[PDB]
């Protein structure tokens, strides 16, 4: 998705700014903040006169669109309700921004100017509000129509101006710049997740990574095929892949924005391009949504895309463990025992617990980078949706400082996670009479035991695990599709590590 929206920050007077649409906030009770009052005064009270008619109650997201008003250079004035509180929460601020965007998308105006600086958002200053506002606007422009014969009508809206006080403009510009890069990374993530699995297979993802290296000269890419995986001894990764006609790929992304002495941060992504379950076959209902089972790997693409645009001074490694999980006459069977890269043997009791089998070999591979943090991202357990639903990612890890850094990043990004414990008592659920580890722990604590399985391959470094099974996509309705989460959390984490 080409994006291309221009976001500008300006400190000019709203009431003399030439624009197709000037956007103003209105509180409940027809109450007017400083910017809206100044525009109203410029029109001679035309805005307060309309509001007195009572059509706009001022609840968050309600709108009233006015045409040409006296003495303004704005062709239209859009009023958006901001509720009755002095301070909006994050959800309300996003809802207001989305309501503005939805109106602007349907207009023929080529630009709009947002005079929303008077809004207050709990716990967020100028930079933090700009981060949320611009990310919501930019990501709200995302369109996936690759396989529609009838394409979307192109938007007339090509430019958005954020009006800010001179004292705040530098922070608003910084927030906008960071949010745009995050949303650009989100768009790549969403594209890859949304692509169907007959197109987006492991080989395709390897070519996508080579494409990203053509676009960004600071990125180096290596794509390893099944011969190299066998050379490296990644027996559990290969066990997942062997049932499919599609070969697996381990994609290595490397970006060196800091000095050679700075240890890298490693992102490990689950790239299961389609998960049938294998011989442990899934039910048919909703199985199409397993095209999103590579969204962990896609979020590594997207985080790299944001970091490469921002040119952050950090050293970053991405490992995308990509395979397709299929039934066949040569597929892995329940009860197979394999030897992982690490040398630990694994009894594969259920071939639908396959993401942890490609991830564990990638976690062993990650040791060579002498990393200062390793984060894996995976659409890993249905149990995580039972535990935390569709709006909060599960988070687990072996280092409290890293876990806290990721939680803090998710809070700032409003792309939240929540820690679940890896108490040693859970580990015995993975005991196998036949191997070093079983790949399932039974019906109890499923998100945790999956994290426990992964932890056995991450003991040599500081590691965390994001289970995005609930947050990586929307299952149904008009908005079915990949979300791009957790690119905002991950990019925020890296922004903080880059300071």
Ligand X SMILES: CC(C)C[C@H](NC(=O)[C@@H](O)[C@H](N)Cc1ccccc1)C(=O)O
Pick out residues in 177-206 that bind a second copy (CB under 8 A): 194, 196-199
The closest alpha carbon to 486, from 409, 427, 432, 374, belongs to 409
Pick out residues in 420-449 that bind ligand X (CB under 6 A): 440, 446
Pick out residues in 290-309 that bind ligand X (CB under 6 A): 293
Between 216 and 292, name the residue whose CB sits nearer to a second copy.
292
Between 305 and 416, name the residue whose CB sits nearer to a second copy.
416
Is residue 124 part of the annotated active site? The answer reads: no
Binding mask 441-480 for a second copy (x = CB under 8 A): --xxxxxx---------------------x-------xxx
After which residues does the chain break, using C–N > 2.5 Å? Answer: none
Between 282 and 460, name the residue whose CB sits nearer to ligand X.
282
Residue in the structure block whose two tokens are 């990612």: 393
Three-state SS annotation for 426-437 = HHHHHCCCCCCE
The closest alpha carbon to 123, from 165, 82, 92, 163, belongs to 92
The site partner of 287 among Mn ion, ligand X, a second copy, none (C-beta below 5 to 8 Å per kind) is a second copy
Q: Cβ(237)–Cβ(361) under 8 Å?
A: yes
Asked if 281 interacts with a second copy (CB under 8 A), we say: yes
Asked if 244 interacts with a second copy (CB under 8 A), we say: yes
Alpha helices (H) in 311-381, listed in sequence order: 355-366
Asked if 166 interacts with a second copy (CB under 8 A), we say: no
Both structure tokens of 58: 């001022």
Asked if 400 interacts with a second copy (CB under 8 A), we say: no
466 three-state secondary structure:
strand
354 labeled binding residue: yes
Longest dimension (CA), the chain: 83
Pick out residues in 458-497 that bind ligand X (CB under 6 A): 469
Among residues 356, 416, 485, 497, which one is catalytic?
Answer: 356
> Which secondary-structure segment (H or E) carries 232?
helix 226-232
Among residues 31, 156, 159, 282, which one is catalytic?
Answer: 282
Is residue 30 part of the annotated active site? The answer reads: no
Asked if 210 interacts with a second copy (CB under 8 A), we say: no
Asked if 110 interacts with a second copy (CB under 8 A), we say: no
Pick out residues in 334-373 that bind ligand X (CB under 6 A): 350, 352-355
Strands (E), 142-287: 159-163, 219-224, 249-256, 265-275
The site partner of 487 among Mn ion, a second copy, ligand X, none (C-beta below 5 to 8 Å per kind) is none
Give, to the nearest 10 degrees, the angle between helix 295-310 and helix 487-497.
Answer: 40
318 three-state secondary structure:
strand
Asked if 4 interacts with a second copy (CB under 8 A), we say: no
| Integer Cα distance of 428 and 8 in angstroms | 56
Q: How many Cα atoms within 13 Å fall on the side-chain side of residue 156?
A: 13
Binding mask 135-154 for a second copy (x = CB under 8 A): ---------x--xxxx----
Name the segment binding ligand X (CB under 6 A); options: 38-46, 138-146, 192-200, 377-385.
377-385
> Which secondary-structure segment (H or E) carries 338?
strand 336-339
Both structure tokens of 52: 């007195």
The site partner of 61 among a second copy, ligand X, Mn ion, none (C-beta below 5 to 8 Å per kind) is none
- Which of the residues are catalytic? 282, 356
Which positions touch ligand X (CB under 6 A)? 275, 293, 350, 352-355, 379-383, 440, 446, 469
């Amino acid at each position: 998705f080409q994006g291309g929206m221009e976001f500008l920050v300006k400190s000019v007077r709203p009431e003399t700014l030439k624009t197709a649409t000037l956007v103003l906030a209105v509180g409940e009770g027809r109450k007017l903040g400083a910017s809206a009052k100044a525009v109203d005064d410029a029109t001679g009270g035309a805005i307060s006169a309309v509001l007195k008619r009572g059509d706009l109650a001022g609840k968050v997201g309600q709108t009233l669109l006015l045409q040409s008003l006296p003495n303004l250079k704005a062709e239209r004035v859009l009023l958006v309700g901001a509720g009755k509180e002095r301070e909006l929460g994050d959800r309300q601020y996003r809802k207001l921004a989305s309501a503005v965007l939805s109106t602007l998308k349907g207009l023929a105006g080529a630009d709009a100017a947002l005079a929303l600086g008077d809004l207050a958002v709990k716990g967020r200053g100028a930079h933090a509000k700009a981060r949320l506002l611009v990310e919501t606007l930019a990501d709200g422009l995302y369109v996936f129509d690759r396989y529609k014969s009838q394409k979307a009508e192109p938007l007339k809206l090509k430019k958005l101006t954020l009006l800010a006080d001179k004292a705040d403009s530098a922070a608003v510009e910084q927030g906008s710049k960071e949010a745009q890069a995050i949303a650009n990374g989100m768009a790549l993530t969403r594209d890859l997740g949304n692509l169907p699995p007959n197109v987006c297979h492991p080989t395709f993802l390897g070519e996508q990574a080579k494409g990203l290296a053509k676009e960004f000269k600071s990125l180096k890419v290596e794509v390893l095929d099944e011969k190299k995986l066998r050379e490296l001894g990644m027996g559990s990764f290969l066990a997942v892949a062997q049932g499919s006609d599609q070969p697996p790929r381990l994609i290595i992304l490397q970006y060196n924005g800091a000095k050679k002495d700075q240890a890298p941060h490693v992102l490990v992504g689950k790239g299961i391009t389609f998960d049938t379950g294998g011989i442990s076959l899934k039910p048919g209902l909703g199985m199409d949504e397993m095209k999103f089972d590579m969204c962990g790997a896609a979020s590594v693409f997207g985080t790299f895309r944001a970091v490469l645009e921002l040119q952050l001074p950090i050293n970053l490694v991405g490992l995308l463990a990509c395979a397709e999980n299929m039934p066949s006459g040569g597929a892995t069977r329940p009860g197979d025992i394999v030897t992982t890269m690490s040398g630990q043997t694994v009894e594969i009791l259920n071939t639908d617990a396959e993401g942890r089998l490609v991830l564990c070999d990638a976690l062993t591979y990650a040791e060579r980078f002498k990393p200062q943090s390793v984060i894996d991202i995976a659409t890993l357990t249905g149990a995580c949706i039972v535990a935390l639903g569709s709006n909060t990612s599960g988070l687990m890890g072996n280092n409290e400082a890293l876990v806290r850094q990721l939680l803090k990043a998710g809070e700032f990004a409003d792309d939240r996670a929540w820690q679940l414990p890896l108490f040693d008592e859970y580990q015995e659920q993975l005991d196998s009479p036949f191997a070093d580890i079983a790949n399932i722990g039974g019906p109890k604590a499923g998100t945790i035991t999956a994290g426990c399985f992964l932890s056995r391959f991450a003991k040599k470094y500081h590691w965390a695990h994001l289970d995005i099974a609930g947050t990586a996509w929307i299952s149904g309705g008009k908005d079915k599709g990949a979300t791009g989460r957790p690119v905002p959390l991950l990019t925020q984490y890296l922004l903080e590590r880059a300071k």
